[PDB]
Amino acid sequence: GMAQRSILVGQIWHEGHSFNPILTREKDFLFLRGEAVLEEARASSTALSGIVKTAEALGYRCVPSISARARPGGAIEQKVFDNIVDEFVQAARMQDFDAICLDLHGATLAEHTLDTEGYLLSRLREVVGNDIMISLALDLHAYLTPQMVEQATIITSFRTTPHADIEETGVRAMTLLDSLSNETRPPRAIYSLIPFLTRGNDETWSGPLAEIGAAADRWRARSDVVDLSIFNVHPFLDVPGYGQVVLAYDNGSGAAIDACRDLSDMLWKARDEFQEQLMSVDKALEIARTSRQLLALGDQGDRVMGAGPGDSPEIARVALEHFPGLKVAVPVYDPQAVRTAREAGENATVRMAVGGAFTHSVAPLERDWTVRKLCRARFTNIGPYMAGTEADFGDAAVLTCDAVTVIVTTMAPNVHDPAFYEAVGVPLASQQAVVARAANHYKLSFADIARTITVDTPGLTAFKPHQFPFTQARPFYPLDIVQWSFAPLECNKV
């Protein structure tokens, strides 16, 4: 037809954990619909922002479906996930569009649906058919499945950890889609599963991913590679077809197989390089005790950014027991503690076990807690990571005992930014160490005001596969000693 071309756009952001017993609920989501989806995209720096800004700079009209963002955590309540998909499907019916370009995480998880993105693509194709193009921007932590490869025209992921190319990945999803406009066929896809999980040393600026990322850039610079991505799968999913994935696209007779071979072999060779020795909590708290600079401690074992619950009071425990007088603040998921605190009121002292209700691996911390402040854990992230984005971890109580402050929260405490501490009235200057529930994504946000050390704590996000009852994920390395060699799936062979 003759009319301006339009692109259907939308977003889902959620990362799951098969071993977090706390379901992600409707409350945990921010939803936008209609034009508001596009207004937010233009004012932000997500992959969706990239998709929408690029589509509009290129002359396309963008048509909204919805956007749905919830912090990482347990599987989404199935009904809520079903309602999200239905809103996508309905937008796919009601609207006029010539192609679809979406910002999805790739490791969203629902209580019954294990491959959520794959499922979403199928439901959309039920309504839109197999001719129109669908392009995805994905997080590199995606659980990338054969169904996804089969149901999408093209897929591209982040290339940095910590994730600093989020928007650019969106730009590229849309640019790739636009580039395919005159093609008489979809591009050929080569999928390769390398059956191991990473256990740290997984940043892209140094370590094994720097070499592998360099090789990847050279492959993509060839005129006979359309694109390629490397997925370091989120390592807390009990799902089949599990491991690292290399995904490459060409015109049917380019280098997608060679690229995928080279990179799969490098990842395999490097499988035991993805390990680290994090500093102990005792050593880190002793640096804090002897430093003028604030310490910001990444609680590796209980990261909400790794879809953990954030109920570990462990760092508070060690501070209390081994460093009396050391001023440490820790954010802890404990909705009951909040409610107990709210009933006692500000200024009361209550004997109470805080934290540890959800992570089997750490004990609740029981003390005479004084309730210094009741307030809402609502604030704006300074960033860089998620700069400008508003957060709300629910009703909160700031609790003290000896020199330790525990801020208990009603919703998952995705603390990766200094604004949290200021918003709940625990000023950073007042502490010698504070806790971030992230390993990599808090560092830039605290770089200017703290020494950042990620510490070797226990819990549901420790890089210890042997601690989890993986069932349908197995076999994978390190748990199983498997004899892998390159064996790709090919899709849209020409």
Nearest to 188 by CA among 443, 454, 493: 493
Least distance in Å: CB of 158 to Zn ion?
A: 7
**Residue nearer to Zn ion on the CB measure, 208 or 306:** 306
**Residue nearer to Zn ion on the CB measure, 375 or 387:** 387
**Residue nearer to Zn ion on the CB measure, 118 or 306:** 306
Least distance in Å: CB of 50 to Zn ion?
A: 16
**Residue nearer to Zn ion on the CB measure, 203 or 265:** 203
| SS3 assignment for the chain | CCCCCEEEEEEEECCEECCCCCCECHHHEEEEECHHHHHHHHCCCCHHHHHHHHHHHCCCEEEEEEEEEECCEECECHHHHHHHHHHHHHHHHHCCCCEEEEEECCCCCECCCCCHHHHHHHHHHHHHCCCCEEEEEECCCCCCCHHHHHHCCEEEECCCCCCCCHHHHHHHHHHHHHHCCCCCCCCEEEEEEECECCECCCCCCCCHHHHHHHHHHHHHCCCCCCEEEEECCCCCCCCCCCCEEEEEEECCCCCHHHHHHHHHHHHHHCHHHCECCCECHHHHHHHHHCCCCEEEEEEHHHCHHHCCCCCCCHHHHHHHHHCCCCCEEEEEECHHHHHHHHHHCCCCEEEEEECCCCCCCCCCEEEEEEEEEEEEEEEECCCCCCCCCEEEEEEEEEEEECCEEEEEECCCCCCCCCHHHHHCCCCHHHCCEEEECCCCCCHHHHCCCEEEEEECCCCCCCCCHHHCCCCCCCCCECCCCCCCCCCCEEECCC
**Residue nearer to Zn ion on the CB measure, 40 or 139:** 139
Rounded Cα distance, 279 and 10, in Å: 41
Least distance in Å: CB of 49 to Zn ion?
A: 17
Least distance in Å: CB of 47 to Zn ion?
A: 11
**Residue nearer to Zn ion on the CB measure, 188 or 234:** 234
**Residue nearer to Zn ion on the CB measure, 89 or 164:** 164
- φ, ψ dihedrals at 445, nearest 5°: -65, -25
**Residue nearer to Zn ion on the CB measure, 72 or 118:** 72
Least distance in Å: CB of 1 to Zn ion?
A: 39
Least distance in Å: CB of 431 to Zn ion?
A: 28
Binding residues vs Zn ion (CB under 5 A): 139, 141
Least distance in Å: CB of 68 to Zn ion?
A: 17
Q: Is position 141 annotated in a ligand binding site?
A: yes
Q: Is position 322 annotated in a ligand binding site?
A: no
**Residue nearer to Zn ion on the CB measure, 14 or 125:** 14
Residue with tokens 């501070």: 319
Q: Is position 416 annotated in a ligand binding site?
A: no
Least distance in Å: CB of 157 to Zn ion?
A: 9
Annotated binding-site residues for Zn(2+) read 139, 141, 163
Indicate the annotated binding residues: 139, 141, 163
